[PDB]
Write an enzyme that holds these catalytic residues in place. Structure first.
Site, mmCIF file in Angstrom:
data_model
loop_
_atom_site.group_PDB
_atom_site.id
_atom_site.type_symbol
_atom_site.label_atom_id
_atom_site.label_comp_id
_atom_site.label_asym_id
_atom_site.label_seq_id
_atom_site.Cartn_x
_atom_site.Cartn_y
_atom_site.Cartn_z
ATOM 1 N N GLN A 259 75.095 34.854 13.192
ATOM 2 C CA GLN A 259 75.381 35.843 14.188
ATOM 3 C C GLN A 259 74.463 36.973 13.859
ATOM 4 O O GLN A 259 74.541 37.578 12.791
ATOM 5 C CB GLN A 259 76.825 36.301 14.081
ATOM 6 C CG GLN A 259 77.826 35.197 14.331
ATOM 7 C CD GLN A 259 79.226 35.627 13.957
ATOM 8 O OE1 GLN A 259 79.453 36.173 12.860
ATOM 9 N NE2 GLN A 259 80.182 35.394 14.856
ATOM 10 N N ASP B 142 75.784 51.365 -5.308
ATOM 11 C CA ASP B 142 76.430 50.051 -5.324
ATOM 12 C C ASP B 142 75.799 49.192 -6.407
ATOM 13 O O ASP B 142 75.269 49.740 -7.407
ATOM 14 C CB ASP B 142 76.388 49.449 -3.902
ATOM 15 C CG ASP B 142 77.539 48.558 -3.592
ATOM 16 O OD1 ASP B 142 77.635 47.481 -4.225
ATOM 17 O OD2 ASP B 142 78.382 48.926 -2.691
ATOM 18 N N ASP C 273 65.583 41.697 6.531
ATOM 19 C CA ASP C 273 66.278 42.591 7.439
ATOM 20 C C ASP C 273 66.493 43.986 6.852
ATOM 21 O O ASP C 273 67.015 44.866 7.538
ATOM 22 C CB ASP C 273 67.633 41.996 7.797
ATOM 23 C CG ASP C 273 67.562 40.645 8.483
ATOM 24 O OD1 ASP C 273 68.678 40.049 8.575
ATOM 25 O OD2 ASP C 273 66.479 40.162 8.856
ATOM 26 N N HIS D 239 77.112 42.339 -3.366
ATOM 27 C CA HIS D 239 77.927 43.381 -2.743
ATOM 28 C C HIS D 239 77.057 44.509 -2.181
ATOM 29 O O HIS D 239 77.210 44.899 -1.017
ATOM 30 C CB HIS D 239 78.890 43.859 -3.806
ATOM 31 C CG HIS D 239 79.932 44.832 -3.352
ATOM 32 N ND1 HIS D 239 79.746 46.201 -3.364
ATOM 33 C CD2 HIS D 239 81.223 44.630 -2.951
ATOM 34 C CE1 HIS D 239 80.877 46.791 -2.988
ATOM 35 N NE2 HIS D 239 81.786 45.861 -2.726
ATOM 36 N N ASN E 291 91.422 48.676 -1.929
ATOM 37 C CA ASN E 291 91.951 47.398 -1.489
ATOM 38 C C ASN E 291 93.284 47.063 -2.143
ATOM 39 O O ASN E 291 93.592 45.874 -2.389
ATOM 40 C CB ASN E 291 90.969 46.274 -1.722
ATOM 41 C CG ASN E 291 89.630 46.607 -1.150
ATOM 42 O OD1 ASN E 291 89.493 47.007 0.013
ATOM 43 N ND2 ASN E 291 88.616 46.580 -1.993
ATOM 44 N N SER F 183 85.180 47.940 1.199
ATOM 45 C CA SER F 183 83.773 48.023 0.905
ATOM 46 C C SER F 183 82.890 47.739 2.120
ATOM 47 O O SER F 183 81.765 48.248 2.200
ATOM 48 C CB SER F 183 83.370 47.026 -0.190
ATOM 49 O OG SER F 183 83.903 47.360 -1.441
#
Ligand SMILES: [Ca+2]
Ligand SMILES: [Ca+2]
Ligand SMILES: [Ca+2]
Ligand SMILES: [Ca+2]
Ligand SMILES: [Ca+2]
Length: 309
Positions: A4, A34, A43, A71, A169, A250
């Protein structure tokens, strides 16, 4: 190469089910603090501007930011992937923004508070040195409020930097929001899943919740959730090329930092406080009512609402 090109969360934040590309963010830097970022990803390569490591024996270490986890690359792609120079890749929210890939987490996904604080301050110093508007995006936190990180967030906010951070989370119980998201000077981001309840997107069960006492006033105090965004089942760029799907606050965080970059680039004279207000008003206009603790108005599951384009 992409399954996608426009993931569900990008369509949701753009409020366009047939969106074919994203746009915006020119001149705004998104400092993704991060696990590093895959600098050669098709990309991302057009947007990489800084690449620094805060996890080593001296600091910063310039021209080093290697992601061995995924991540950080994944978060970066949600914020600002540009489809690649062949337009065959994935798009993030603000594909024209600049990426500052600051590695503050070890390859395990965990990082030390002094390193995180140093990077927050460095991003601010770089915003000041370059004269350019900067958003710090932190898809990380802890239940505990570390004072090195807090003071760094204050320093950055004083320099005109916008800070966006994950709620955590640890949900869905009351009072699970972590830091730095829970700081007054950081925008805490809750995660939505691609499910409707009560006529709106639903907050994911894992998303950490704020506190009853200070929710409802549409004014952010310590412990308040601020903005909800897509976080569950998010397809994005990955560290060894290609793509992957992961979930969490995240993943919600870079939707918001990318949206903030898109808005700031549209309206580049805004202060960080004014940009924050614009984001808050966008969110307020899309009240989230689904998920445990979610309610009519500002609530401790979803904050002000879902800021969209
Ligand atoms: Ca720049
Ligand atoms: Ca260290
Ligand atoms: Ca906050
Ligand atoms: Ca409040
Ligand atoms: Ca609500």
């Amino acid at each position: 190469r992409a399954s996608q090109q426009i993931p569900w969360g990008i369509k949701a934040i753009y409020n366009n089910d047939t969106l074919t590309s994203t746009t915006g963010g020119s001149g705004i830097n998104i400092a993704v603090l991060d696990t590093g970022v895959n600098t050669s990803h098709p990309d991302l390569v057009n947007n990489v501007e800084q690449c620094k490591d805060f996890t080593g024996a001296t600091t910063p270490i310039n021209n080093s930011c290697t992601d061995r986890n995924g991540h950080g690359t994944h978060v970066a792609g949600t914020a600002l992937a540009d489809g690649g120079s062949d337009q065959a890749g994935i798009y993030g929210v603000a594909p024209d923004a600049d990426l500052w890939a600051y590695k503050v987490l070890l390859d395990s996904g965990s990082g030390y508070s002094d390193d995180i604080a140093a990077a927050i301050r460095h991003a601010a110093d770089q915003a000041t040195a370059t004269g350019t508007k900067t958003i710090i995006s932190m898809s990380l936190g802890s239940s505990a409020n570390n004072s090195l990180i807090s003071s760094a967030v204050n320093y950055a906010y004083s320099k005109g930097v916008l800070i966006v951070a994950a709620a955590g989370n640890s949900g869905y119980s009351q009072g699970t929001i972590g830091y730095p998201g829970a700081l007054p000077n950081a925008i805490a981001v809750a995660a939505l899943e691609n499910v409707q309840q009560n006529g709106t997107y639903r907050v994911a069960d894992y998303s950490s919740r704020g506190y009853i006492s200070t929710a409802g006033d549409y004014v952010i105090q310590e412990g308040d959730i601020e903005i909800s965004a897509p976080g569950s089942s998010v397809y994005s760029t990955w560290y060894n090329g290609g793509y992957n799907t992961i979930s969490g606050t995240s993943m919600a965080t870079p939707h918001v930092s990318g949206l903030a970059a898109k808005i700031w680039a549209e309206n580049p004279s805004l202060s960080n406080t004014q940009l924050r207000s614009n984001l808050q008003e966008r969110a307020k206009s899309v009240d989230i009512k689904g998920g445990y603790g979610a309610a009519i108005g500002d609530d401790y599951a979803s904050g002000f609402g879902f800021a969209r384009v």
